[PDB]
């Protein structure tokens, strides 16, 4: 048997319903989502980190000339100058006065700290949604992970539940993301091969251990000071460090809908947007005959206490007269009031107490008891606390 | 190689029921467990009861509790025409012979023929799109799946348990007036029955005469085997104990190798204005696939075993086909 | 078993095994853009006119 239902996407708050066959006792269903995660299609593109100015020993030739040999290291710069008069601790390295030549060749290499400190680039799109559900259909309670796309049902006791796709394809992430130290930021980094000096992406590497890197640090060699063997070099500061000092606030606190971010793998969860539809396929063996369940007669409502707060604040005493003692489900067909419990145990000639939540000053709602209906009515009082520490359990009717 | 033979050295031979040993239902040491036929060139693997290779090429089989052996070149199997034995190790055999409907294997040690026939299909699979019945003398090379000739420790394993307490009506004998149980040399056994009260006794290489139960047909002396093992097969009872105690790996696992496959005759082509006619003279039934090089394929597939003439229309976008195992041929026309 | 995509696919795309992929079939047009440095250019007068 095919049944359709809808669920506002939000964890914690439970959901109660009864499927009512025209000639058999209603079958109860309870649903509780635990975690609703949303994982994107994310493909890694590159990685960056601190760089280190690789500088060999200066190549000095004394009264002669030299040439440049390109090692083809990334962003290599080579230069030769004349008219050098170097010194050493033990006097003069040379005796020549002029014609001396010195050659400098400089480059960049990845810092030793690349493994533990490195910012990753990511291209995100195509969010897929997963969920953990705690569902009980006909006192068959289960906790299970389910693919809530438009296929992939999960079956237990013959009951086949299918959670359809979301009504909204919104995602908190932008197309290009940057990851670092477990924090996530939506940033527009320049793409591979187009890095610029003094900004993010000056040094470029396909992977952590690619061993082939592109670089634009704009390294410039300079004439060393006279009477000293050394090589002065000038370059823009680390754009990674400039971005480190800039660091706009994190997505964990900037995202709308209050979406929390964890990255063991990149994912976002526990934030309410849209609705998830549920499709039940129930086998015909789970339906029980009416005579095998208690049936009531002359049942009446009374409203004992009212507080139309966020939490359940309506207490109702229902007085009944039963042919049998046995548990049955109680349901409110409309959204006027939402009950707290999925089932209530029932004596022969006792009275039942029911907790519910409503936002109506003058509620008048029809409850469905084991096989009959009763019409509870009354007025209700405002709350006392201005703010609470939990969300709303009910809807806001117009 | 003994490192791998010692695994199957210490298990057993065993006997089992047979549908036909040339005389009705029967009990034979030549029961066939199951047949698997997935190899391309017709290589088949058989799982018999008697084990092989234990000595270079010899068979060893049980007979009413006693072991015997025979050289391998005296046992023969067939489906429709005589088959051929390549190699045998442990419980398994590798054979090669064409398709059929049943597997019938037999031998003749004394002047009495032992046989079993079973209805398990064997299927000959042609490699490629050019079907045949016997691989050709010449052709081209392709990668198919054949069962490797080597016996090496792979990851595939089979299960093995302790033997059941098989009965033997021969041991119980009649004295002047009594029933005597005479276990063979150095073997243990267990005698059961209810002729008076209830009796379940054990014997360890001792002959026992029972004063009561002074007749033949009543009751039973089961054997005991401890240092030997059996395969988990439906034709043996399971003794007490749900233990498993070990498993063994299988030889002749499927492998990948180069494979000879036939080549079809070169088609005779005749051209026309946006049309091409094909003359075809297959030696054996062959496939044809033809498709256009446009967004609509209109793919057309045929099996042909007789000569015929087939005309096709080719547009500017292009035509393509394969006839048999030849490389694809693409034809592209122009304005004339 | 049905005919393969390498024998019935449109546009004659050839499919290989190791990465699931297709090659050598014509569809559409690739736009290309070039940023050429001035170093490779030559003066008109230095070329025959």
């Amino acid at each position: 048997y095919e049944h359709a239902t809808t669920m506002p996407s939000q964890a914690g708050i439970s959901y109660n319903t009864i499927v009512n066959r025209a000639g058999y006792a209603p079958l109860p269903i309870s649903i509780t989502p635990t975690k609703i995660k949303l994982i994107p299609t994310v493909n890694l593109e590159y990685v960056t980190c601190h760089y280190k100015t690789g500088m060999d020993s200066p190549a000095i030739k004394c009264c002669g000339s030299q040439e440049c040999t390109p090692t083809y290291r990334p962003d290599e710069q080579c230069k030769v100058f004349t008219g050098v008069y170097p010194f050493m601790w033990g006097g003069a390295y040379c005796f020549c006065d002029t014609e001396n030549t010195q050659v400098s060749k400089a480059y960049v290499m990845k810092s030793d700290d690349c493994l533990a400190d490195h910012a990753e680039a990511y291209k995100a799109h195509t969010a897929s949604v997963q969920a953990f559900l705690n569902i009980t259909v006909g006192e068959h309670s289960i906790v299970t992970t389910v693919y809530v796309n438009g296929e992939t049902p999960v079956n237990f006791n013959g009951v086949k539940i299918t959670a359809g796709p979301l009504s909204t394809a919104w995602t908190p992430f932008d197309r290009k993301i940057v990851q670092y130290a477990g924090e996530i930021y939506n940033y527009d980094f320049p793409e591979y091969g187009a890095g610029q000096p003094g900004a993010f992406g000056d040094i470029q590497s396909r992977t952590v251990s690619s061993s082939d890197l592109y670089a634009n640090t704009n390294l410039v060699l300079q004439r060393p000071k006279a009477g000293a063997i050394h090589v002065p070099y000038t370059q823009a500061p680390s754009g990674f460090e400039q971005w480190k000092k800039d660091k706009a606030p994190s997505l964990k606190f900037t995202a709308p809908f209050g979406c929390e971010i964890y990255t063991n793998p990149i994912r976002a969860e526990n934030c309410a947007v849209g609705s998830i539809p549920l499709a039940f396929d129930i086998p015909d063996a789970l339906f029980t005959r009416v005579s095998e369940t208690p049936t009531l007669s002359a049942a009446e409502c009374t409203l004992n206490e009212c507080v139309y707060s966020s939490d359940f604040g309506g207490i109702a005493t229902v007085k009944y007269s039963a042919s049998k003692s046995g548990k049955c489900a109680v349901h409110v067909p409309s959204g006027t009031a939402t009950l707290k419990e999925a089932a209530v145990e029932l004596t022969e000639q006792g009275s039942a107490t029911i907790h519910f939540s409503t936002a109506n000053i003058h509620p008048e709602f029809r409850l469905q008891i084991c096989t009959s209906y009763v019409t509870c009515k009354g007025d209700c009082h405002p709350p006392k606390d201005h703010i609470v520490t939990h969300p709303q359990y009910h809807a806001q009717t117009f | 190689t003994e490192e791998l033979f010692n695994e199957y050295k210490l298990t057993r031979p065993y006997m089992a029921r047979c549908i036909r040993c040339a005389v009705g239902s029967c009990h034979s040491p030549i029961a066939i467990e199951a047949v698997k036929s997935d190899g391309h060139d017709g290589y088949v693997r058989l799982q018999t009861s008697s084990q092989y290779g234990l000595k270079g090429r010899t068979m060893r089989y049980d007979m009413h509790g006693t072991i015997k052996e025979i050289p391998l070149h005296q046992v023969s199997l067939y489906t429709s025409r005589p088959c051929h034995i390549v190699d045998g190790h442990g419980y398994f055999l590798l054979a090669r012979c064409p398709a059929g409907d049943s597997i019938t294997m037999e031998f003749k040690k004394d002047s009495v023929r032992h046989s079993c026939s079973v209805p398990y299909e064997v299927k000959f699979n042609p490699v490629g799109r050019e079907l045949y019945t016997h691989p050709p003398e010449h052709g081209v090379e392709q990668a198919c799946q054949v069962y490797a000739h080597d016996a090496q420790n792979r990851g595939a394993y089979v299960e093995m348990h302790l033997p059941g307490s098989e009965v033997d009506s021969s041991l119980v004998s009649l004295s002047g007036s009594s029933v005597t149980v005479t276990p063979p040399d150095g073997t243990s056994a267990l005698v059961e029955c209810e002729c008076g009260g209830t009796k379940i006794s054990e014997t360890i290489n001792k002959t026992k005469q029972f004063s009561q139960c002074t007749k033949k047909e009543q009751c039973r002396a089961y054997r005991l085997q401890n240092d030997k093992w059996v395969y988990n097969s439906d034709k043996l009872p399971k003794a007490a104990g749900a233990t498993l105690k070990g498993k063994l790996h299988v030889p002749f696992l499927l492998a990948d190798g180069k494979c000879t496959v036939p080549l079809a005759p070169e088609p005779m082509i005749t051209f026309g204005f946006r049309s091409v006619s094909l003359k075809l003279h297959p030696k054996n039934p062959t496939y044809l696939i033809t498709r256009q090089l446009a967004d609509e394929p209109h793919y057309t597939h045929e099996l042909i075993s007789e000569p015929a003439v087939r005309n096709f229309t080719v547009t500017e976008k292009g035509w393509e086909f394969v006839w048999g195992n030849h490389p694809p041929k693409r034809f592209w026309a122009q304005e004339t | 078993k049905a005919p393969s995509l390498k024998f019935t696919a449109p546009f004659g795309c050839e499919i290989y095994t190791n990465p699931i992929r297709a090659e050598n079939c014509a569809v559409g047009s690739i736009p290309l853009a070039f940023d050429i440095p001035d170093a490779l250019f030559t003066r008109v007068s230095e070329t025959p006119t």
Partner: nanobody
Framework: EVQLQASGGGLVQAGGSLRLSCAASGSIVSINVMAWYRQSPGKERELVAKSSGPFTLYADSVKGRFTISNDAAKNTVDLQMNSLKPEDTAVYYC?????????????????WGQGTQVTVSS
């Protein structure tokens, strides 16, 4: 992205015994297949070893001499290579197929490392 790193090889005399190792790095949790392929100069690519879980498979020209072991926990394969002949010189590549990304953005199926050179001297 997922990659394969190959280590081992070198120049040795005939009759020696070496080990070739290939390791997988990236966003992967389980691997269905890992195999070895050899490419000699002037010829085409051919398979040598074939390992996936407990099962193994060997070619015709490599039986009884080379052994393949796989560690899915480390996602590595070790080809213990013995009884060298002059025909064994080639560049060896390690391949991985049927990759199950840990959701794990689905991506390319197969990968190919740079490989290692093995040369044998008579």
């Amino acid at each position: 992205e997922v990659q394969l790193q190959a280590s081992g090889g070198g120049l040795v005399q005939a009759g020696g015994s070496l080990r070739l190792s290939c390791a997988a790095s990236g966003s992967i949790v389980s691997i269905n297949v890992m195999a070895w392929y050899r490419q000699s100069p002037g010829k085409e690519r051919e398979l040598v070893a074939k390992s996936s879980g407990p099962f193994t498979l060997y070619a015709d020209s490599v039986k009884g001499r080379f052994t393949i072991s796989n560690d899915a926990a480390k996602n590595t394969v070790d080809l213990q290579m013995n009884s060298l002949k002059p025909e064994d010189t080639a560049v060896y590549y390690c391949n991985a197929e049927g990759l199950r990304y840990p959701s794990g953005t689905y991506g390319p199926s197969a990968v190919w490392g740079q490989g290692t050179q093995v040369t044998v001297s008579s």
